[PDB]
Amino acid sequence: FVNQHLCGSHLVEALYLVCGERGAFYT
Amino acid sequence: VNQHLCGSHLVEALYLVCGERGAFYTPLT
Amino acid sequence: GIVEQCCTSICSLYQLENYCN
Amino acid sequence: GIVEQCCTSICSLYQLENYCN
């Protein structure tokens, strides 16, 4: 199934995707 | 981390990015 | 924080974007 | 298309946004 909760590596990948070259608070 | 978006993870990425608007990849809400 | 907003609950693109930069 | 761009390779946010409604 598709999980709409973002946990672990899926949360980390999601930050890469949405922030892009910005990087983020957890970089 | 795996940076590729495949399978259920590609559908989830679209849910996240496209919001409730939907998308052309699959007929989800 | 991010864990409660995005893992426990469901978060939006904009909420996730608040952790950028 | 989007599988080649984002699954086989790595895609940016703009590339996924091209598929949105």
Author numbering:
A (entry chain B): 1 to 27
B (entry chain F): 2 to 30
C (entry chain A), D (entry chain E): 1 to 21
Task: Kindly provide excerpts from the paper associated with this entry.
Insulin is a small protein hormone composed of chain A (21 residues) and chain B (30 residues), and it exerts its biological effects by binding to the ~340 kDa tyrosine-kinase type insulin receptor (IR). Insulin plays a central role in mammalian biology, and has a widespread impact on blood glucose levels, lipid and protein metabolism, cell growth/differentiation, and life span2. To achieve the stabilization of a specific conformation of the hormone, we developed the strategy of inserting a covalent bridge between specific sites at the B24–B30 C-terminus of the insulin B-chain, i.e., an intramolecular side-chain:side-chain crosslinking. The evidence for the structural impact of the crosslinking in the analogues reported here comes from three crystal (analogues 2, 10, 11) and two NMR (analogues 8, 12) structures.
The long (i + 5) separation between clicking groups was first chosen to assure a wide and gentle sweep of the main chain conformation, i.e., to minimize its structural strain, and to allow the B23–B30 chain to attain a conformation similar to the B26-like turn, or to the bend of the hormone observed in the insulin:IR complexes. However, the IR-A affinities of all of B24–B29 crosslinked analogues 1–5 were negligible (<1%), regardless of the R/S permutations of the Cα chirality of the crosslinking precursors (propargylglycine and azidonorleucine). The B24–B29 linker spans a long stretch of the B-chain, strongly affecting the local and global conformation of this inactive analogue. First, the linker significantly increases the mobility and disorder of this part of insulin, and it is well defined in only one of four independent hormone molecules in the crystal, with one B-chain untraceable after CysB19. Although the triazole part of the linker (in the most ordered molecule) occupies roughly the PheB24 site of the native insulin, the B23–B30 main chain is very distorted (e.g. 3.8 Å difference at the B25 Cα atoms from the native hormone). However, it seems that not the increased dynamics of the B20–B30 chain but a peculiar conformation of the large B24–B29 ‘macrocycle’ of this analogue abolishes its IR-A affinity. Any modeling of analogue 2 (or its B24–B30 part only) on the insulin:IR complex leads to large clashes of the B24–B29 loop with the L1 surface of the receptor, or its αCT segment. This extensive steric hindrance occurs despite the general, and reasonable, match between the triazole moiety and the PheB24 site on the L1 domain. However, it is also possible that the polar character of the electron-rich triazole ring is incompatible with the PheB24 hydrophobic binding pocket (Asn15, Leu37, Phe39 and Phe714) on the IR. Therefore, the lack of any IR-A affinity of analogue 2 likely can result from both the disruption of the B24 site (on insulin and IR), and an unfavorable conformation of the large B24–B29 macrocycle on the αCT-L1-domain.
